[PDB]
Amino acid sequence: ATFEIVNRCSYTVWAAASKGDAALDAGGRQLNSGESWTINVEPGTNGGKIWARTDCYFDDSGSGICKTGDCGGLLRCKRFGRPPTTLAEFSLNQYGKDYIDISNIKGFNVPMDFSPTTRGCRGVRCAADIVGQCPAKLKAPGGGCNDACTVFQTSEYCCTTGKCGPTEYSRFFKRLCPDAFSYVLDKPTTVTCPGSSNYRVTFCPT
């Protein structure tokens, strides 16, 4: 499957793509304002994620640091990034169907649209000013708006027992971005697309 990753933000982002134990494609690249990066994701990929990283410094070997979404200091991510990270999540070719969603379970750093470029399903977006409106206790110094699990590490926010409810903090994310997951047991906002669809992820869509 092809994903075109587009940076419409006015600032540089460092895109990342991983399935948690391996890179997808090259795993990461710098995207200046307006740049597009096309990656190929193997069919059958389960549990893939794409995110943006902000305020990164990398040396010649591709080693460095980012203020949001750092993936163990590497330009080319093999593992998932440090919150806060708005996430585009996907599982491809799962019994004939692809499943896509956007998630704020690991917080929010950059607004995002995640849409098919082929026919037969709808896209999803979270493009509100979550950082500007972020509750004081969730604001990340480096930028972004952390989720409450990351900040407080309780069973209720992390849904550790498999039982949890919405919270004042999850409801903040949900109010601003209804079509994104706000906590682990949120009513799913997953979209079902035809197997083998292609997609575009746009940072700062509006």
Q: Kindly give, in sequence order, each residue whose CB lies less than 8 Å from that of residue 98, ignoring residues fewer than 6 positions away.
A: 1, 90, 91, 92, 192, 193, 194, 195, 196, 197
Q: Tokens representing 136?
A: 């004081």
| Element of type H or E holding 172 | helix 168-176
Q: Strand, helix or coil at 64?
A: strand
Q: Tokens representing 160?
A: 């550790």
Resolution (A): 1.5
Distance in angstroms (rounded) separating the CA atoms of residues 199 and 1 = 8
Tell me if 33 sits within 8 A of 9, measured CB to CB. Answer: yes
Beta strands 36-40 and 2-7: pairing type? Answer: antiparallel
DSSP 140: -
Q: Which experimental approach was used here?
A: X-ray
Is 102 exposed, middle or buried, given 0-12, 13-18 or 19+ CB atoms closer than 10 A? buried
- Quickly count: other Cβ atoms within 10 Å of residue 186's Cβ: 17
Distance in angstroms (rounded) separating the CA atoms of residues 194 and 118 = 9
Distance in angstroms (rounded) separating the CA atoms of residues 18 and 20 = 5
**DSSP H helical ranges for 7-98:** none
Distance in angstroms (rounded) separating the CA atoms of residues 86 and 12 = 16
Place of tokens 């037969």: 120
- Quickly count: other Cβ atoms within 10 Å of residue 35's Cβ: 15
Domains in the chain: ranges and CATH = 1-206 (2.60.110.10)
Beta bridge partners of 7: 203
Distance in angstroms (rounded) separating the CA atoms of residues 165 and 159 = 8
Phi, psi of 132 (to 5 degrees): -65, -35
| Element of type H or E holding 122 | none
Place of tokens 């806060």: 84
- Quickly count: other Cβ atoms within 10 Å of residue 167's Cβ: 17
Instruction: Tell me, rounded to whole angstroms, the distance of Cα 145 from its chain centroid.
Output: 13
Nearest to 206 by CA among 128, 144, 131: 128
Buried-state track 134-162, b at ≥16 Cβ within 10 A, e below 16: beeebebebbbbbbbbbbeeeebbbbeee
- Quickly count: other Cβ atoms within 10 Å of residue 19's Cβ: 19
